Amino acid sequence: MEAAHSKSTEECLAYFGVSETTGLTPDQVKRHLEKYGHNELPAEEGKSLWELVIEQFEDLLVRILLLAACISFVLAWFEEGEETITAFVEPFVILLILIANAIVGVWQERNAENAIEALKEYEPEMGKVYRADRKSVQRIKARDIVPGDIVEVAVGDKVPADIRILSIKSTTLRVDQSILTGESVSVIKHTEPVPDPRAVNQDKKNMLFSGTNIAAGKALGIVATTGVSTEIGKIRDQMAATEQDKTPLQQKLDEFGEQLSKVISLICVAVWLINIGHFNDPVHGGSWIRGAIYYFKIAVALAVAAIPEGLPAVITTCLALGTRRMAKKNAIVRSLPSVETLGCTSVICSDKTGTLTTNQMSVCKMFIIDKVDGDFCSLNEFSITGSTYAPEGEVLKNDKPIRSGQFDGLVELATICALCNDSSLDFNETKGVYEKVGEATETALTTLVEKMNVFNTEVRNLSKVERANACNSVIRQLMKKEFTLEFSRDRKSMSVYCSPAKSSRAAVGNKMFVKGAPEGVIDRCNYVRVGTTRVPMTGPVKEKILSVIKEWGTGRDTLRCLALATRDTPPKREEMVLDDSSRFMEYETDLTFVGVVGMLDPPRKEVMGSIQLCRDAGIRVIMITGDNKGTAIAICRRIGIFGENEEVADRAYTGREFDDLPLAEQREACRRACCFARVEPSHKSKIVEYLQSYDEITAMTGDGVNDAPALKKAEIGIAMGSGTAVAKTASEMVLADDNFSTIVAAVEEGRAIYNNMKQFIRYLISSNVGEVVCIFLTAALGLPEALIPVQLLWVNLVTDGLPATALGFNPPDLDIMDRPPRSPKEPLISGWLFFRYMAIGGYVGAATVGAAAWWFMYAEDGPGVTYHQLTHFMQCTEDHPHFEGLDCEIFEAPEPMTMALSVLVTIEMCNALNSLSENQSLMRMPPWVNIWLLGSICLSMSLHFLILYVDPLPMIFKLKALDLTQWLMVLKISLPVIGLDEILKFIARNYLEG
Numbered sequence: 001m002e003a004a005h006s007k008s009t010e011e012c013l014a015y016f017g018v019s020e021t022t023g024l025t026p027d028q029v030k031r032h033l034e035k036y037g038h039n040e041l042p043a044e045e046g047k048s049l050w051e052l053v054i055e056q057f058e059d060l061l062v063r064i065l066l067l068a069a070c071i072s073f074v075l076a077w078f079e080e081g082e083e084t085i086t087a088f089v090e091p092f093v094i095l096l097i098l099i100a101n102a103i104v105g106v107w108q109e110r111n112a113e114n115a116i117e118a119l120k121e122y123e124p125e126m127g128k129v130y131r132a133d134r135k136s137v138q139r140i141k142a143r144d145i146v147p148g149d150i151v152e153v154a155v156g157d158k159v160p161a162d163i164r165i166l167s168i169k170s171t172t173l174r175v176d177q178s179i180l181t182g183e184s185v186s187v188i189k190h191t192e193p194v195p196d197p198r199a200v201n202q203d204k205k206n207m208l209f210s211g212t213n214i215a216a217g218k219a220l221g222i223v224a225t226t227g228v229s230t231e232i233g234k235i236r237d238q239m240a241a242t243e244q245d246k247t248p249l250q251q252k253l254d255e256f257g258e259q260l261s262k263v264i265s266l267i268c269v270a271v272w273l274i275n276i277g278h279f280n281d282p283v284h285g286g287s288w289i290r291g292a293i294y295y296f297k298i299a300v301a302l303a304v305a306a307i308p309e310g311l312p313a314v315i316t317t318c319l320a321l322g323t324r325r326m327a328k329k330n331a332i333v334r335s336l337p338s339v340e341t342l343g344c345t346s347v348i349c350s351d352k353t354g355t356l357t358t359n360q361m362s363v364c365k366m367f368i369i370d371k372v373d374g375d376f377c378s379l380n381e382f383s384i385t386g387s388t389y390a391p392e393g394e395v396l397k398n399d400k401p402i403r404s405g406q407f408d409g410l411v412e413l414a415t416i417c418a419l420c421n422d423s424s425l426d427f428n429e430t431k432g433v434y435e436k437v438g439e440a441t442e443t444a445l446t447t448l449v450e451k452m453n454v455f456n457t458e459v460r461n462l463s464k465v466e467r468a469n470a471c472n473s474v475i476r477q478l479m480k481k482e483f484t485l486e487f488s489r490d491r492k493s494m495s496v497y498c499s500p501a502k503s504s505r506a507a508v509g510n511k512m513f514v515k516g517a518p519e520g521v522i523d524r525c526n527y528v529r530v531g532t533t534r535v536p537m538t539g540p541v542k543e544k545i546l547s548v549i550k551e552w553g554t555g556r557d558t559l560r561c562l563a564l565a566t567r568d569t570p571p572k573r574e575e576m577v578l579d580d581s582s583r584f585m586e587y588e589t590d591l592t593f594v595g596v597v598g599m600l601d602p603p604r605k606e607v608m609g610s611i612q613l614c615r616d617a618g619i620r621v622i623m624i625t626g627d628n629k630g631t632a633i634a635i636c637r638r639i640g641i642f643g644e645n646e647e648v649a650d651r652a653y654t655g656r657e658f659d660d661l662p663l664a665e666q667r668e669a670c671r672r673a674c675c676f677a678r679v680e681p682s683h684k685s686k687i688v689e690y691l692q693s694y695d696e697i698t699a700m701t702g703d704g705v706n707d708a709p710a711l712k713k714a715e716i717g718i719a720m721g722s723g724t725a726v727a728k729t730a731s732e733m734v735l736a737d738d739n740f741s742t743i744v745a746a747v748e749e750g751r752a753i754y755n756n757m758k759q760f761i762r763y764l765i766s767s768n769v770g771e772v773v774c775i776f777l778t779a780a781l782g783l784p785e786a787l788i789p790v791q792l793l794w795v796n797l798v799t800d801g802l803p804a805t806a807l808g809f810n811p812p813d814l815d816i817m818d819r820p821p822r823s824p825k826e827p828l829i830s831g832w833l834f835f836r837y838m839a840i841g842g843y844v845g846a847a848t849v850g851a852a853a854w855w856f857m858y859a860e861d862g863p864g865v866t867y868h869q870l871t872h873f874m875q876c877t878e879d880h881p882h883f884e885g886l887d888c889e890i891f892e893a894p895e896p897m898t899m900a901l902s903v904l905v906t907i908e909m910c911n912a913l914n915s916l917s918e919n920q921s922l923m924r925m926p927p928w929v930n931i932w933l934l935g936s937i938c939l940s941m942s943l944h945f946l947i948l949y950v951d952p953l954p955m956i957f958k959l960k961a962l963d964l965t966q967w968l969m970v971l972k973i974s975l976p977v978i979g980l981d982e983i984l985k986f987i988a989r990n991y992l993e994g
């Protein structure tokens with residue numbers, strides 16, 4: 001393999017020692033295959049169904065539950081017999097939540113798609129080569145093609161390896177490498193070497209890239225690199241060497257797990273110490289075995305009370321909803337977990353042409369020389385109208401209408417436009433619009449022609465399909481297009497050789513019409529054309545031309561300028577080598593300037609507003625274009641990235657200036673830059689790394705397979721809905737309408753989603769805190785189980801999930817896009833907030849335990865234990881004589897439990913209202929603000945009545961409905977919650993740090 005683009009035609013055949021007429025020999029093929037390997041992109045992640053499920057049981061919180069479901073399965077099995085048929089219900093429900101939960105993880109994943117697998121498609125199944133054992137061409141599998149052997153490709157064929165072209169069999173060879181370079185039109189290939197050893201792929205005119213298509217022609221070539229060493233295999237290597245972090249929330253989740261693990265084990269050490277007097281008890285006492293069942297059975301209650309089981313459900317249904325909500329605004333979010341790391345974006349690098357602008361070119365101004373008398377000079381500037389490609393508009397000189405024929409300068413400018421142009425128009429009936437056929441800036445030229453019919457040829461007497469290429473084909477019949485010197489970035493221009501048509505145009509027949517960048521072609525102009533006559537380019541005339549070119553392309557117009565010229569007396573046809581673009585700049589010299597054409601790519605309207613919102617939201621926007629740095633900047637000023645008068649010396653670099661910088665200033669330029677002139681893929685990936693070294697959340701746009709490694713590296717890669725499918729699969733989101741204003745509409749929902757999603761998380765987390773306080777009082781004291789695991793699940797999954805998912809429908813703040821981007825290191829609960837849940841929890845923990853111990857003691861209808869030990873329920877059946885006058889089975893009564901479960905369920909609807917806002921009082925922000933919330937609270941309550949009054953339900957949850965007075969006890973305990981928090985909110989607002 002090797003950098004063949006520069007060597008030559010023989011230096012390559014020699015390097016490998018292979019004959020262009022024989023190919024590689026069977027022995028060579030064997031050795032080469034051993035040294036370079038097969039022509040493939042490496043294998044895949046052999047992730048097995050067994051490992052995928054094991055991945056499921058590696059979370060700390062999922063393991064903690066699995067252990068509990070076991071301890072609970074052993075209890076609800078052996079020790080505990082008869083008197084209960086529900087044993088196993090507890091272990092069974094926990095297992096469902098797990099195994100069922102793991103299905104989510106395995107389905108979710110099986111439907112996921114690898115960006116690196118998307119490339120595998122750009123590989124032809126087979127290829128055509130010339131081996132040294134058959135004169136006929138053989139057609140083997142692309143997999144066996146090797147560096148060095150002679151390959152043949154023709155139209156349709158998809159290039160099998162990176163090939164260095166030896167000789168073109170056809171008259172012309174056209175390749176389509178848009179996916180790998182971004183070039184829209186099929187490009188022309190050659191055989192002569194490219195001197196530069198560090199050329200970009202756009203300039204390796206003598207190379208075929210594995211993965212592209214042969215648009216036109218047939219040619220032979222020697223295979224340079226194979227498999228992973230090809231321009232596409234090198235991309236596969238960057239996307240694979242790259243590592244995806246994880247949405248900050250997923251990080252805060254690993255953090256919460258580690259903690260909710262340390263705390264749990266502490267709670268047991270604590271509970272154990274609180275009950276240390278037991279080491280001061282009778283050795284023969286008894287109940288020894290019952291005590292262990294109490295602690296083992298409270299361990300399962302502790303675990304299902306600490307972990308928020310409904311959450312994974314509430315979060316993914318909140319995202320899936322928003323997903324659909326964004327999709328109505330052309331933002332197709334692929335990865336859900338990524339909706340969070342969007343609200344946090346601080347920098348947005350967008351591509352210009354398709355996303356920032358319309359990419360719908362049109363000429364607005366023209367100008368030809370009118371007089372050149374010594375140092376005096378007068379131009380002839382025109383204005384044209386029409387923004388579509390539609391041949392409808394007029395040419396107005398000085399605001400005033402004009403007939404283009406009346407100017408001779410304008411007769412030529414119009415041919416150079418219709419002759420030096422590979423693109424045309426087309427009118428369809430389907431949508432009744434004029435559709436650009438070839439290129440955007442070329443089709444804009446044929447359109448210019450139609451609007452200024454210099455010959456005034458009749459046309460209103462024609463249809464619309466035809467009207468399209470009317471004035472153009474009349475000029476096509478006046479000159480005969482011999483050949484054409486294609487565009488190449490070296491000279492930045494193109495031309496066409498044209499001889500006349502008949503004796504009606506015999507005079508000075510052979511002409512050469514060239515159009516290119518102004519600086520370029522104007523240096524090669526020895527004359528100017530004033531009408532039908534001619535003069536020598538002189539200092540004054542040249543400065544008068546270059547200035548107007550500056551105003552047009554740097555002024556508020558931000559027009560892209562084209563200079564058109566002609567080579568009056570071209571070289572003899574025979575004296576031209578029409579197959580080596582290197583010499584092409586020699587044939588386009590000694591020109592006579594004819595005029596320049598200034599066109600415009602109108603920027604999408606809503607873009608100008610989107611840029612403004614980012615200014616307010618505190619997000620930095622970087623424009624990445626191709627325009628020279630002069631107009632690249634101008635475009636920034638027009639849209640808002642830069643101020644009309646704002647300085648831009650250190651905030652706008654070109655790909656070259658940036659490279660010339662030392663790693664230090666390079667990294668410093670990235671924290672202030674807002675526009676990058678001419679950059680390639682190399683650059684898009686470096687800027688991400690620098691933007692990342694400042695711990696920034698960056699968005700990046702792309703469409704080609706060459707944009708894949710950069711989209712994967714940016715926190716959120718935004719692929720174009722019209723770009724390749726490999727880009728889409730390496731991106732978090734896809735802009736259906738390639739509109740930049742769509743990104744900003746998506747950075748807003750992300751902030752909205754996360755704000756709501758932030759509330760319901762704090763909510764659910766706080767109720768878990770309360771259930772833990774309860775279980776911890778119940779055991780520290782010795783009291784009888786107030787709350788059972790089965791009940792807690794119902795609550796965490798259903799009765800709390802409903803008020804939880806409804807909080808996701810909260811009204812978005814009105815200043816969401818006036819605040820800076822959120823920091824990813826912002827914790828969900830800390831400072832004062834940590835203290836309110838610390839207090840609210842401590843409250844419900846008391847309310848639940850208490851409301852149960854109440855029905856025991858000061859209970860209008862139940863046992864009774866004013867101040868004595870109802871806590872020693874463990875030791876009674878045998879201690880009935882000692883303070884125990886009654887039945888030792890009341891301690892398994894349902895009333896106490898449904899007492900404490902009703903105080904939890906209601907203290908939860910209360911807390912769901914305190915959660916409509918972090919610090920806003922309920923008087924200032926009423927519950928009816930969110931209807932879904934109130935409506936879910938009802939469904940929760942009724943859902944609560946269901947498991948009390950039904951039949952199999954009250955039995956399996958161990959709950960017996962409670963009378964109307966016991967319900968009023970629940971309210972008198974619960975409701976005051978809304979007060980304890982209203983008071984805590986008042987604190988935060990008033991007395992405190994704002």
Ligand SMILES: C/C=C(/C)C(=O)O[C@@H]1C[C@H]2[C@@H]([C@H]1C)[C@@H]1OC(=O)[C@@](C)(O)[C@@]1(O)[C@@H](OC(=O)CCC)C[C@]2(C)OC(C)=O
Pocket residue numbers: 252253255256259260261263306761765766768769772773827828829830834835837838841
């Ligand atoms: C949950 C039940 C119990 C019994 C418990 O023990 O919760 C503990 C206390 C604390 C711990 C959480 C481990 C948690 O760990 C962290 O990472 C912190 C620093 O962020 C954290 O401090 C907060 O929770 C969070 O942010 C969660 C963000 C998703 C507050 C919390 C929960 O206390 C309070 C009062 O909410």
Ligand SMILES: [Mg+2]
Pocket residue numbers: 181182702703704707
């Ligand atoms: Mg691209």
Ligand code: NA
Pocket residue numbers: 711712713714715716717730731732
């Ligand atoms: Na990415």
